[PDB]
Amino acid sequence: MASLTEIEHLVQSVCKSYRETCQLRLEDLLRQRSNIFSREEVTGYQRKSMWEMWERCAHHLTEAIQYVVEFAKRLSGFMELCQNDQIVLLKAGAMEVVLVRMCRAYNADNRTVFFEGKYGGMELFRALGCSELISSIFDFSHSLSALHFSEDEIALYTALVLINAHRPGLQEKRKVEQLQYNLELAFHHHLCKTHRQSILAKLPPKGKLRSLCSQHVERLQIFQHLHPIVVQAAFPPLYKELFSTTERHKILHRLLQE
Numbered sequence: 001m002a003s004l005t006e007i008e009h010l011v012q013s014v015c016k017s018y019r020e021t022c023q024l025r026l027e028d029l030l031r032q033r034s035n036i037f038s039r040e041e042v043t044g045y046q047r048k049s050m051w052e053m054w055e056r057c058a059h060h061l062t063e064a065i066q067y068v069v070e071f072a073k074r075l076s077g078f079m080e081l082c083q084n085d086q087i088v089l090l091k092a093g094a095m096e097v098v099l100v101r102m103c104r105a106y107n108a109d110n111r112t113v114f115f116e117g118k119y120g121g122m123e124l125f126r127a128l129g130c131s132e133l134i135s136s137i138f139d140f141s142h143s144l145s146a147l148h149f150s151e152d153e154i155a156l157y158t159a160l161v162l163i164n165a166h167r168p169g170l171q172e173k174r175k176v177e178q179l180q181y182n183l184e185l186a187f188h189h190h191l192c193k194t195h196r197q198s199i200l201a202k203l204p205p206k207g208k209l210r211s212l213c214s215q216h217v218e219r220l221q222i223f224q225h226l227h228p229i230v231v232q233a234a235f236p237p238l239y240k241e242l243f244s245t246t247e248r249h250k251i252l253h254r255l256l257q258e
Ligand SMILES: O=C(O)[C@H]1CC[C@H](C(=O)N2CC[C@](c3ccc(C(F)(C(F)(F)F)C(F)(F)F)cc3)(S(=O)(=O)c3ccc(F)cc3)C2)CC1
Pocket: 021, 022, 023, 024, 025, 054, 056, 057, 058, 060, 061, 064, 067, 098, 099, 101, 102, 105, 113, 114, 115, 116, 125, 128, 130, 133, 134, 137, 138, 216
């Protein structure tokens, strides 16, 4: 299995799939760095209802997920996996891929993130009532900024975040293991060739991404208790499907069968 040329073709493939499926251009995110929210605009966001902020944030997250599904569809070997495994992998990895992709929209110089047209800090998200989660997200992006990833490095790393053979519920585990192995080789080969093997030890532990997702699900269940009809009426169906709590994932299935 997999010669050196198959691995080199894989590297170019994963990078191509990633470039093609990014919600935003890195070039445009970097140009907008100067475009920072005014204290009036900040006050505006801070004065918005909890449920309005959640609805806006669930919408922007659903947008990002949509592109991650597209990344998975274009990812070499993913469509060869059975529909159960496709759902298992996306249900668990899509948020994690979004969280990794997020660092590109994070400015480490100040401590701002690109949100709804301009750059703003933590204070922008005060109304959500989930300060701990917001702080965890900002630190996570901050720690990734330190590694100074290239677009190819994010491409190869997110491919692995998604193709994780240890996810509970995998039917054809061995099939995911061989796809994981080849993607790990592709990442490692590109790191070797570019003299960037050093970042491997510096990468965040698998426990840090797991906690962010767990926290998100925890905070969402609190919000759903206070405003359950906001969730029923104004939350994206794909968001409810992946986080509310072929079978119970009709939207994800339709997106895959396209
Ligand atoms: O594909 C790409 O090129 C990228 C993918 C990532 C995109 C991005 O930055 N994001 C996708 C939407 C973003 C996003 C991230 C996290 C969450 C939440 F967890 C919580 F709000 F709690 F943080 C929630 F669900 F609970 F509400 C919602 C939505 S956002 O722009 O709405 C944003 C929200 C909060 C931030 F603190 C920073 C940004 C982040 C930018 C474009």
